[PDB]
């Protein structure tokens, strides 16, 4: 594995290079909104984002070393978390608003147009406000996003060795996070504290994904890929 040999700076460079682009929605302000229209817009956007996410994952150091079945499992598990932390990152500069796309900026009032959406919106807004107050850096964001990919499905016959490899790469990304914070001039106490703060947010991103997922495969109760990603969570 090359991932275990990369320096902290090389890991950052790799993750930054691997970043997916920001896509546009089909949003037309001159067109009337509705529950179906709003959900169709977000679904359409998520679906196109997934394709880029899959290719992004291929460029996350250590991911390609895994079996194909494991790669599938990790992405099935983490895809909504990854979409959500991306959404939250883009939305940092827009307090009280969610920036799904450069042409799609929504506030929580428009969240009430879909059943159960306003609850997820508030949680996303809270997360965004947290990132903003912490002054989350782009280098930190790409580390967190890669952690989510590798961590979210590591639990859930040797392949214990495969689990071990994931744990090793996760330690590497931790080292990288610390490296960035030390580079930033934080004291050791401040480094550990900030590291903890960032990782605790991942628990909130997990919660938001699970709650969102719960509502999402009840909405249908969508493209084929997205339908299969949703179905993986039953």
């Amino acid at each position: 594995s090359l991932a275990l040999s990369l320096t902290a700076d090389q890991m950052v460079s790799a993750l930054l290079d691997a970043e997916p682009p920001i896509l546009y929605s089909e949003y037309d302000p001159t067109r009337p909104f509705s529950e179906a229209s709003m959900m169709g817009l977000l679904t359409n956007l998520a679906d196109r984002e997934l394709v880029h996410m899959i290719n992004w994952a291929k460029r996350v150091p250590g991911f390609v070393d895994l079996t194909l079945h494991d790669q599938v499992h990790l992405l099935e598990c983490a895809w909504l978390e990854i979409l959500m932390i991306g959404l939250v990152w883009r939305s940092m500069e827009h307090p009280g608003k969610l920036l799904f796309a450069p042409n799609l900026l929504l506030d929580r009032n428009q969240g009430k147009c879909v059943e159960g959406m306003v609850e997820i919106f508030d949680m996303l807004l809270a997360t965004s406000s947290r990132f903003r107050m912490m002054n989350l850096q782009g280098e930190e964001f790409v580390c967190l996003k890669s952690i989510i990919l590798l961590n979210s499905g590591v639990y859930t016959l040797k392949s214990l060795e495969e689990k071990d490899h994931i744990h090793r790469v996760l330690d590497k990304i931790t080292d990288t996070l610390i490296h960035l914070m030390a580079k930033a001039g934080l004291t050791l106490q401040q480094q550990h504290q900030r590291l903890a703060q960032l990782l605790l947010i991942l628990s909130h991103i997990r919660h938001m994904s699970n709650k969102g997922m719960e509502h999402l495969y009840s909405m249908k109760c969508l493209s084929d890929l997205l339908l299969e990603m949703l179905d993986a969570h039953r």
């Binding site: 394709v51 899959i54 194909l68 599938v72 299969e228």
Partner: peptide, 10 residues
């Protein structure tokens, strides 16, 4: 699965 396929596409 489509995800399985897209992961294979070298």
């Amino acid at each position: 699965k489509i995800l399985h396929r897209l992961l294979q596409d070298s």
